[PDB]
């Protein structure tokens, strides 16, 4: 086997910033022959198909902006990204085709960018769901940043953890920011005791939590 | 335009077989070698195996991992590409990728495809509970408004979700399910200026191609 791995697992960089990141196989892919480097690199964006930006080591694939840089030889080899922009949020993968194929493992690159606060949202049960007997009740907490955030729910001012789902979307990659959506799943019966229903959400961007809400008998 | 597209992923039981297909066109099919490439939800990629072109004898060769259990194949005839798997299991669950690879020149994958989910389960296809995300009625609407839609207690994964049939596709954020006793359940947003909404209808369109459901979600006001 030929293995290949990489470093670092991942890190964050901010956008103007140069990004440094390798790949070691366990042998050399130097072909004596062809005296070429069997070594590609890959990148990997949310949601897309890994796309291929060097190869040979250090041939530059047409189309690949200048900014990238593939370097080194033999077992170790380096993908270099100087001044970094959003957009290349994405896992990297360096791939060896000496003997043939092995992927490394992956470095995840993500973007530093300055602290924002959540534009928070709240949405009671819709009617055609409460017809079937069940009540969900959603947050949206929109374009924040760091990632870090706490949520929490409260029904007529007392904490509910219990029936909670939360989801964060990939860094977004044009400004940056993460997404997070917290369900609140009821039985419509539980859902009709209660009164008030409000998400709070905490954030290093200020010391008082966003809240957001609504009362049942309102709606 | 070079194109590659996979088909045939989707629900399949441990110990069961599937084949998966790959369809190609732009450029001339027996010149290049092909591969397989998977990777299992949030984790690495792995290749799997390849099959060679026509100056070496369409031969093939295969990662230890799968070696003995998937087969690779192609129709030269039609520029598809094949992958017949057996004796699945759980670690199979994956995206499938295929990839032109090798053209004897160039050590590369140059082109891939846009990949078919392949979950290995004995839990039942359930298709999904779509529901409308609007603002209660003490909504204080101000100058944006978001709403949403709640794709709800599907299995398997995935789902795809638009908006306004795509052209809505900006300001929306649509967050990765998460699997809660055998059912997933998404949300996806969609924030708008408030001009545009309610007077312009926004809609969700929500496809669950494992049930073959489609479904179309008008976000109605509450009051309105
Ligand atoms: C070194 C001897 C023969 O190898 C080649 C050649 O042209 O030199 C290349 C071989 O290609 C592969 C392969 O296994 O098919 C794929 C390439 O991506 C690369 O990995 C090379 C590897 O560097 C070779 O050791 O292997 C293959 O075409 C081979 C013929 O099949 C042999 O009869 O010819
Ligand atoms: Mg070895
Ligand atoms: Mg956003
Ligand atoms: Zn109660």
Redesign the interface.
Same mark, same amino acid.
């Given at each position: 086997?030929i293995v290949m791995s990489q470093s670092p697992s991942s890190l964050a960089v901010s956008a103007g910033e140069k990004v440094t990141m390798s790949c070691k196989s366990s042998q050399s892919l130097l072909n004596s022959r062809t005296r #070429?480097n *069997?070594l590609?690199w *890959?990148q990997?964006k949310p949601g897309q198909? %890994? #796309? $291929?930006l060097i *190869?040979?080591a250090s041939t530059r694939?047409s189309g690949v902006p200048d900014r990238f840089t593939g370097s080194g030889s033999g077992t170790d080899f380096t993908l270099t990204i100087t001044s970094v922009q959003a957009e290349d949020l994405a896992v990297y *993968?360096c #791939?060896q085709?000496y003997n $043939?194929? !092995?992927?490394?493992?992956?470095t995840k690159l993500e973007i530093k960018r300055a602290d924002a606060a959540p534009?928070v @949202?709240?949405? %009671?049960? @819709?009617s055609?769901?409460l017809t079937?007997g069940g009540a969900?009740v959603?947050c949206?907490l929109?374009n924040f940043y760091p990632k870090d955030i706490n949520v929490k729910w409260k029904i007529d001012g007392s904490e509910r953890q219990n029936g909670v $789902?939360?989801?964060? !979307?990939?860094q977004d990659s044009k400004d940056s920011t993460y997404?997070?959506?917290s !369900?609140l799943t009821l039985t419509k019966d539980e859902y009709e005791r209660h009164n008030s229903y409000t998400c709070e959400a905490t954030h290093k961007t200020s010391t008082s939590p966003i809240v957001k809400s609504?009362?049942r008998n309102?709606? | 335009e070079v194109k590659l597209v996979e088909s045939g992923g989707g629900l399949v039981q441990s110990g069961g077989s599937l084949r998966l297909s790959c369809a190609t066109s732009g450029f001339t099919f027996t010149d290049y070698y092909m591969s397989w490439v998977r990777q299992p939800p949030g984790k690495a990629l792995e290749w799997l195996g390849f099959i060679r072109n026509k100056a070496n004898g369409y031969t093939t060769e295969y990662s230890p991992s799968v070696k003995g259990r998937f087969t690779i194949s192609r129709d030269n005839s039609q520029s598809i590409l094949y992958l017949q798997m057996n004796t699945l299991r759980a670690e199979d669950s994956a995206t499938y990728y295929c990839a032109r690879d090798h053209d004897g020149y160039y050590e590369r994958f140059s082109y891939w495809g846009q990949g078919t989910l392949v979950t290995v389960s004995a839990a039942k296809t359930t298709p999904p509970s779509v529901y409308p995300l609007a603002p209660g009625s003490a909504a204080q609407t101000n100058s944006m408004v978001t709403l949403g839609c709640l794709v709800k207690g599907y299995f398997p994964e995935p789902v795809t979700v638009t908006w306004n049939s795509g052209s809505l596709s900006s300001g929306v954020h649509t967050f990765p399910a998460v699997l809660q006793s055998d059912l997933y359940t998404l949300s996806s947003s969609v924030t708008v200026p408030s001009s545009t909404w309610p007077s312009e209808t926004v809609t969700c369109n929500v496809a669950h191609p494992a049930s073959s459901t489609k479904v179309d979600k008008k976000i109605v006001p509450r009051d309105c």
């Open positions: 086997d #070429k *069997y590609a *890959y990997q198909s %890994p #796309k $291929l *190869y040979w694939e *993968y #791939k085709s $043939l194929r !092995t992927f490394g493992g992956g534009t @949202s709240i949405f %009671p049960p @819709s055609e769901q079937s969900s959603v949206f929109n $789902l939360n989801s964060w !979307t990939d997404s997070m959506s !369900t609504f009362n309102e709606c | -």
